[PDB]
Amino acid sequence: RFLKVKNWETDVVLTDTLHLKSTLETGCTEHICMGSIMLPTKDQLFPLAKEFLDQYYSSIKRFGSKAHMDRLEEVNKEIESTSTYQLKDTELIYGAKHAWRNASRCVGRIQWSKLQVFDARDCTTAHGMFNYICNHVKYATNKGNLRSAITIFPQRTDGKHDFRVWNSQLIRYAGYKQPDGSTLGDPANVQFTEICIQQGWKAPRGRFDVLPLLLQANGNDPELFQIPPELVLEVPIRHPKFDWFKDLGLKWYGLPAVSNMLLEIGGLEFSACPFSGWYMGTEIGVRNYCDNSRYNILEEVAKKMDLDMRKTSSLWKDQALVEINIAVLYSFQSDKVTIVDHHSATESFIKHMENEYRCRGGCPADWVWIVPPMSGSITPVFHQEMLNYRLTPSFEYQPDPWNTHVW
Amino acid sequence: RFLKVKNWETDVVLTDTLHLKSTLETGCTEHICMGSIMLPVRTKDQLFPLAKEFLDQYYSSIKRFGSKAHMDRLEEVNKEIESTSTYQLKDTELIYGAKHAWRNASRCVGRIQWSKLQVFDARDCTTAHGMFNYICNHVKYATNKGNLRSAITIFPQRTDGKHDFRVWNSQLIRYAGYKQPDGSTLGDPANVQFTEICIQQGWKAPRGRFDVLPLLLQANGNDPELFQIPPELVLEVPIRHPKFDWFKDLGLKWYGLPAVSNMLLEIGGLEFSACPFSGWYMGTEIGVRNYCDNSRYNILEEVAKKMDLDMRKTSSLWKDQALVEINIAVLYSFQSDKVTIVDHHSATESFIKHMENEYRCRGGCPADWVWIVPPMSGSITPVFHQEMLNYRLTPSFEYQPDPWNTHVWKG
Ligand code: HEM
Ligand code: HEM
Ligand SMILES: CNCCN(C)c1cncc(CCc2cc(C)cc(N)n2)c1
Ligand SMILES: CNCCN(C)c1cncc(CCc2cc(C)cc(N)n2)c1
Ligand SMILES: C[C@H](O)[C@H](O)[C@H]1CNc2nc(N)[nH]c(=O)c2N1
Ligand SMILES: C[C@H](O)[C@H](O)[C@H]1CNc2nc(N)[nH]c(=O)c2N1
Ligand SMILES: [Zn+2]
Secondary structure, three states, X not given: OOEEEEEOOOOOEEEEOHXXXXXXXXXXXXXXXXXXXXXXXXXXXXXXXXXXXXXXXXXXXXXXXXXXXXXXXXXXXXXXXXXXXXXXXXXXXHHHHHHHHOOOOXXXXXXXXXXXXXXXXXXXXXXXXXXXXXXXXXXXXXXXXXXXXXXXXXXXXXXXXXXXXXXXXXXXXXXXXXXXOXXXXXXXXXXXXXXXXXXXXXXXXXXXOEOOEEEEOOOOOOEEXXXXXXXXXXXXXXXXXXXXXXXXXXXXXXXXXXXXXXXXXXXXXXXXXXXEOOOEHXXXXXXXXXXXXXXXXXXXXXXXXXXXXXXXXXXXXXXXXXXHHHHHHHHHHHOOOOOEOHHHHHHHHHHHHHHHHHHHOOOOOOHHHHOOOOOHHHOHHHHEOOOEOOOOOEEEOOOOHHHOOOO | XXXXXXXXXXXXXXXXXXXXXXXXXXXXXXXXXXXXXOOOOOOHHHHHHHHHHHXXXXXXXXXXXOOHHHHHHHHHHHHHHHHHOOOOOOHHHHHHHHHHHHHOOOOOOOHHHOOOOEEEEXXXXXXXXXXXXXXXHHHHHHHHHHOOOOEEEEOOOOOOOOOOOEEOXXXXXXXXXXXXXXXXXXXXXXXXXXXXXXXXXXXXXXXXXXXXXXXXXXXXXXXXXXXXXXXXXXXXXXXXXXXXXXXXXXXXXXXXXXXXXXXXXXXXXXEEOOOOEEXXXXXXXXXHHHHHOOOOOOOHHHHHHHOOOOOOOHHHOHHHHHHHHHHHXXXXXXXXXXXXXXOHHHHHHHHHHHHHHHHHHXXXXXXXXXXHOOOOOHHHOHHHHEOOOEOOOOOEEEOOXXXXXXXXXXX
């Protein structure tokens, strides 16, 4: 019941007490581990509020204070009368930071306390949403010196008035099915692209077209907006040694900004809460560029390098992989757009993890997601035992709105 | 109950029913996943159901379930258990059992080969000298002049836990590690403790970087005894690189035969505490882990220096670049010397086919994603994108305590 995690590289052992505050289910049982599975009322509401407010007031060394009791009382009143309650600005900021802190699949959590929270709870229309998102994008981008941010739209009420950003990220490239049977652009975005066209977007049918935002306010029908092109910072990809690399015509956007997740704080649900940080190189170079079901460029790069692609054992894929990832990091650095390599990031996460165990009694971490998609065992996280469990406040997955939306 | 797994690269969905036969625990609960945790004397009471479960499976597998032969065998074992407190497996059951322990090994990417396993029955062995002989024969047969063959040698099962057969080595063939007074390590740091035990037991250490350890063999609960595997039986491969001529001068080699010797084989409730097994290497085991772990030979820097990579910032990915060249070298060297080896692309691709075949024919394939995914180039191998279900089936291979912590010394 008091769990130990061992680092097999360093022999360092940490004791986890924090997991006993866990609440949501893991998908696992004593008979079966689902660790590798990607997606495993007033009565209900007040204990959630209380649990949250208890931890909030503990964090400000005011547990059991009158102001603590007062707040608890006030919230209980409000839930009883109005069936929901409103978070204080302080509570909202605390909650959003802790959702990030609790994100077990995020390697970048050493940064968790430095998050800029934009309160967009006063937003009522999709136009309003668009303005808030432009401001987020511009703030977070900061001319390439990226700053973590989250913009938080009105909370769920009855479920029939949800705010939703239909896009999975604020910034992504379109994907088009060709008559050639092939796929043009990002294959991961074909369906959403269709919905944009369906909703009237005039697609330029290019390879790196920035998708428009599809914004839904107050449970109304979603509307289309185009992010001002001058606010979308992009990095052309070149290689420091290979002059030919630029001829691939590759580029990527600077701002990773997740927009389809649900923020839960104190039992309240924020269905529209886009958040952003900065990229770890492998996200672009390994996954976005080299996944078979993505831009899938390995072969083309390999050919340009004149590798023996006859036999897997020449490790031509591994060689091209490295070079592609070298180019990504080099291109971002050259353009002064913030980026972190997988060595630096995983090293930071180890130190964060030690800080968290020391100051919080633990740190929930999903090893399957934390270990980078290349060079796994030469990063310190590979040798680090981790315990995965769910703490709230939290970011959750939610269904794509087009399967949900009564038009 | 039905469980589905999805491959996120291909969208192929498989349905697992085999997990319904799962037995032992995972370490996980509804509240906590311990999927990345490395390490999560028996009464007649518990024994017969375990025997029975096993024999029902064996008899189903040979399409003789419910047969008189099946029924007589259950009867025979039941009686032998109530008479003698244990029972002996038929040779057929032992072989079936050993193959299935491998088949069930959720951490093994090489399981496409599971039905091809040479089983050496050493249950008649009584002494450490006898164990040495059996192990030499296993090594010679398995090595096969570089054309490696999978094999397992099975020594007598546990009785009261006071007469265990144990191979004290973690692998049949491994290199000594020596801690120096200046705190540096000569040879393989992983094997420092065991090397020290060998030396204390009388082993004369050459004290070089690649000294093959002696066997430390325990028969029938007696104190273990030292034996040197005949050098001519230990196949090794000098590591060179197809393009970089300086790579040979790193002075690296490795042995050809990976042979785990510290695990416990459970079959029908019986416990085989000494059951060394061997196959052939996947390149990354050597090129990534053995050579490049900071806690092992740790050669990344020396290699990267010689390639003259920019080592001033990790962002140059000098470690990644050197890592690849080393793994190219391992594969090159083994192939050149005609010693069996498989790259991580081939091995993971074969595993996916095996896994799918298993779902279709067996109703599932327990697999530990954390172990299955190779330690380099994870997501450009198909296993990375494959959801897996980890559970425990018997017969199985299990961890056991290192014998030096538990052995009662006779003296
Ligand atoms: C500031 C630098 C950051 C870095 C380097 C970073 C890094 C990463 C990486 C590599 C992943 C795996 C993503 C994937 O493979 O798709 C991830 C996931 C995640 N991150 Fe972070 N992140 C950062 C900031 C943030 C922020 C600001 C938040 C929230 C406020 C956040 C919350 C999450 C969540 C919830 C996931 C899981 C996503 C999912 O399950 O799909 N991250 N992060
Ligand atoms: C024939 C070629 C084989 C290949 C290429 C192969 C591949 C692998 C690899 C790469 C690992 C991970 C090792 C590590 O990271 O320490 C492993 C583990 C394992 N293998 Fe296989 N293997 C083979 C044969 C066998 C055989 C013959 C058996 C048993 C009869 C077996 C049973 C196991 C078990 C029980 C593990 C888990 C080891 C542990 O938990 O420490 N394998 N295998
Ligand atoms: C299963 N993933 C497919 C969709 N995808 C590529 C994706 C999913 N989930 C999250 C992200 C972005 C991850 C991320 C987020 C933030 C804030 C920073 C960062 N460096 N990466 C991307
Ligand atoms: C605890 N981890 C380090 C111990 N170690 C190096 C190790 C552990 N477990 C297994 C092996 C050898 C793995 C193996 C076994 C067999 C039969 C074939 C193969 N290719 N690899 C080595
Ligand atoms: C902590 C973590 O479980 C540990 O480093 C594991 C990860 N996956 C592994 N996978 C294999 N094949 N072999 C290993 O030793 C490990 N080590
Ligand atoms: C099946 C498996 O869970 C899936 O491929 C996971 C593996 N680990 C991952 N890790 C990260 N960071 N991101 C991912 O999308 C995935 N995909
Ligand atoms: Zn689990």
